[PDB]
Structure formats: structure tokens, C-alpha cells
């Protein structure tokens, strides 16, 4: 019996971009979800398939903590059944998703006066991403019928686009650290139970 490292996932100094979102597997620990509420009031705390009031009473098999920084106007796209740029080309949640989407503003940590180009997102791709699919490709995407052959021609663009992330931006453009907890609710085994 020991406390799960949810605090270490939340308080991480350097977060990953949305096209290369990190994944941490939580196992063999006491899933005390009460430590989540120690942070500031979240911008979005929508839960699916479970209730946020009794997470410490249920027991889960696999607990995946997905961490990625997105734009404020794009937080609504991380939800089962949404459609958008981030939902199709960066992070696609399954329709039968079971978990909570936790997002909070991080304009003081992820922004810089001269621009913060460390965070990037995928502007366009060939097809939509499957649920929980990560694509770290950086090859030049061709838009016209003629092959680009890896150069930025008249109709050839880079697949990734960098975020601005300046502190003077609006609330819809400020960075938001999103932690998506994926819960496999006791399918075959019983491994990660809450405090009892």
C-alpha cells in the first residue's frame, strides 16, 4: 500500500506537446484521487462513465495519465464524440471513454514574453487519428497532386504548427495543461483500488 504518483504527474515542470503527449501507467498503488483537488480551480473537470464524487470508492484495472498542453479555445475538443483539429490530428478520445478530463490554465508557466515555440500541434494530416493513437511524424505533408519530395514548394506545408503562448493573449489563447485519466474499470482483473 502506497500513494499513487498523481501529484508527480500533475506538478510536472515540463509538459509535452499535444502531438507528442506523454503517457504514464499507474499501477500497484492506492488510487487516492483526493490529491487532485489540491490544485487551483480547474477550467474543465468533466468526467465520463464515472462520478467525480466517488472515485476513491471504485477500483480500476489500468489508470493512464495523458498529459499535454493545448490552447484555451481547444479544450472543448477533448471529449468523447468531438470533432476538430486537435481531436482529429492530435488527440482522439474513444467514444466509449471512461475517465475524467482535467484542465487548468497555465499562462504563468507555459508562456514567455518573446513567444513560447516549444509547444506545437499538427495542422493537417492524411486521415484522422484512431483513439489513443500517437503520431510523432515530422515529414513534410503534400497537398497538391505533384510530389513535394520533402521541400516547401508552392503547395507544400509543414505538418506541425507552433503555438504562440504569449501572456498577453486572451483566455482562449492562453496555455492549458490537460490531464486525461483513462480508466479501465475492472474489466478482467482488480489491481488498482482506492483507499479503504
Amino acid at each position, epitope marked *: 500500500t502506497n500513494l499513487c504518483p498523481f501529484h508527480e504527474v500533475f506538478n510536472a515542470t515540463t509538459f509535452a506537446s499535444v502531438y507528442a503527449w506523454n503517457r504514464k501507467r499507474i499501477s500497484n498503488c492506492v488510487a487516492d484521487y483526493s490529491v487532485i483537488y489540491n490544485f*487551483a*480551480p*480547474f*477550467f474543465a473537470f468533466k468526467c465520463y462513465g464515472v462520478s467525480p464524487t466517488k472515485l476513491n470508492d471504485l477500483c480500476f484495472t489500468n489508470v493512464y495519465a495523458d498529459s499535454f498542453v493545448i490552447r484555451g479555445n481547444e479544450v472543448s475538443q477533448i471529449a468523447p464524440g468531438q470533432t476538430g483539429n486537435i481531436a482529429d490530428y492530435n488527440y482522439k478520445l474513444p467514444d466509449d471513454f471512461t475517465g475524467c478530463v482535467i484542465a*487548468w*490554465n497555465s*499562462n*504563468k508557466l507555459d*508562456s514567455k*514574453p*518573446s513567444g513560447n515555440y516549444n509547444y506545437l500541434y499538427r495542422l493537417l494530416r492524411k486521415s484522422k487519428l484512431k483513439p489513443f493513437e500517437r503520431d510523432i511524424s515530422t515529414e513534410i505533408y503534400q497537398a497538391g497532386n505533384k510530389p513535394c519530395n520533402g521541400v516547401a514548394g508552392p503547395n507544400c506545408y509543414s505538418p506541425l504548427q507552433s503555438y504562440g503562448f*504569449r*501572456p*498577453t*493573449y*486572451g*483566455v*482562449g*489563447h492562453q496555455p492549458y495543461r490537460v490531464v486525461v485519466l483513462s480508466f479501465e474499470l475492472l474489466h478482467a482483473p482488480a489491481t488498482v483500488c482506492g483507499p479503504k
Partner: antibody, heavy 123, light 112 residues
């Protein structure tokens, strides 16, 4: 409508902590305007920005007053307070509290201001 | 720092054109929005021009703002000056580090 009103001790002894509470009516400290600032103005001088606070704990203070200015948010009472410790003789000013609009592309629109209160710093 | 500088005082006959200068000592005035507030003697400031070209409801058409990126400065032109417009005007902008900066204030005086 949205109205702001300042409150607190009208006189603070020197070297003490100046504490003023701004009560907002018609709107909570929430997704409404996302910002709540403090502005002071000495008699016969221009305005001076102190700092604004976000409902998610984000604080942005003036570089010349970063060490002394401490702003706290209390969403349960729709009141945000300003704490200015180690007051000096030059801190005599009318402290206003005004909301700032952030829903646009960038921060702007100091739309609604308060009536302000003159807090002297002499014993 | 983004210390804006305004003229200390300006005076002109009524019904004429009056321009208030707002020069940026550093940074860029085009990176952030410029707002103008009118603070009459013994009152709270009121927004006159925001987003550098937008005027809220209730403000007369006599107030209009413009941006001059070639001189990294802004200007507030007044069309048809009258008695009720005699007040203090502060131009406000934002530094790149989320620091809001106000101007020094321009004392308008109706000479007529």
C-alpha cells in the same frame, strides 16, 4: 449591473500591512471577465497599476512592487483583496479595483471601475 | 519596461481638432492594444476608446483613436472640442510580460 466597491481600513499605520477588499456585485470571480485588477492614484498624480488576479490563482504584479504586493481571490464571497505590506509615506493614494476583459484576442478593456478609497499612511 | 509618455498639458479653442500624443519608450505599441480612459476631477476613469479603433456605447463620436506603427506611437484626435471634454486622459497598453502600463496623463484645457 456590474458594480465594484472598495472597502477596508481608511488609515494604516506606517510599516504595517495595507489591506483592502473589493466586493463585486452582479458578477462573480469566474469565467465572466477572467481578470480583477487594482489601480492606485496619489492625489495630483497619475494612475499606477498594481496587479490583477485570475480566478485560477494566476497573479501578475507590477515589477516595481513585486515584493510587497500580494493579491488573494475568494470566489466564495465574490471578493478579492489586496495586501500591500511595508507601507511607505509615498503610498498615499486612492486605490481602485477594476475588471479587465480577456475574452478577446488580447487583454484589454478596463471597463468597470470602482469608486476608490483614500487610504493614508500616517499615524 | 513599456513606459508610455504623454504631454503634460494641451489647450485649444473649442470646435477645433485636438490630438493627444502617446509615445512608447520601448517595446512596440502595435503588439498590444491601446486604451484611453477619461477621468474627470473627482470621479473614476471611464473607457473612451478600446482595441484602438472601437468606441463603446454612450461615448460621443467626437472621440476616435488611431495607431501609427511607423513612429511606435498612438494618438487620440478630438473632433469638435467642448466644455464637457475637459478632463484627464490616460493611454494604457500592456508590456510583453503581462504587465499593464498606464500613461502620465494629459491635462486638456478649454481655452474658449
Amino acid at each position: 449591473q456590474v458594480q465594484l466597491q472598495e472597502s477596508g481600513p481608511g488609515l494604516v499605520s506606517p510599516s504595517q500591512t495595507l489591506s483592502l477588499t473589493c466586493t463585486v456585485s452582479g458578477g462573480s470571480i469566474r469565467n465572466e471577465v477572467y481578470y480583477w485588477s487594482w489601480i492606485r492614484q496619489p492625489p495630483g498624480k497619475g494612475l499606477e497599476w498594481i496587479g490583477y488576479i485570475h480566478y485560477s490563482g494566476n497573479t501578475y504584479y507590477n515589477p516595481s512592487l513585486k515584493s510587497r504586493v500580494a493579491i488573494s481571490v475568494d470566489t466564495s464571497k465574490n471578493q478579492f483583496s489586496l495586501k500591500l505590506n511595508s507601507v511607505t509615506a509615498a503610498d498615499t493614494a486612492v486605490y481602485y479595483c477594476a475588471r479587465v476583459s480577456v475574452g478577446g484576442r488580447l487583454v484589454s478593456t478596463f471597463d468597470y471601475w470602482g469608486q476608490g478609497t483614500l487610504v493614508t499612511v500616517a499615524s | 519596461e513599456f513606459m508610455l509618455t504623454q504631454p503634460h498639458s494641451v489647450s485649444e479653442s473649442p470646435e477645433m481638432t485636438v490630438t493627444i500624443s502617446c509615445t512608447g519608450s520601448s517595446g512596440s505599441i502595435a503588439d498590444n492594444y491601446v486604451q484611453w480612459y477619461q477621468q474627470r476631477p473627482g470621479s473614476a476613469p471611464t473607457t473612451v476608446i478600446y482595441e484602438n479603433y472601437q468606441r463603446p456605447s454612450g461615448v460621443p463620436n467626437r472621440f476616435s483613436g488611431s495607431i501609427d506603427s511607423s513612429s511606435n506611437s498612438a494618438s487620440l484626435t478630438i473632433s469638435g472640442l467642448k466644455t464637457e471634454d475637459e478632463a484627464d486622459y490616460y493611454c494604457q497598453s500592456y508590456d510583453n510580460s503581462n504587465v499593464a502600463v498606464f500613461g502620465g496623463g494629459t491635462q486638456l484645457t478649454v481655452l474658449g
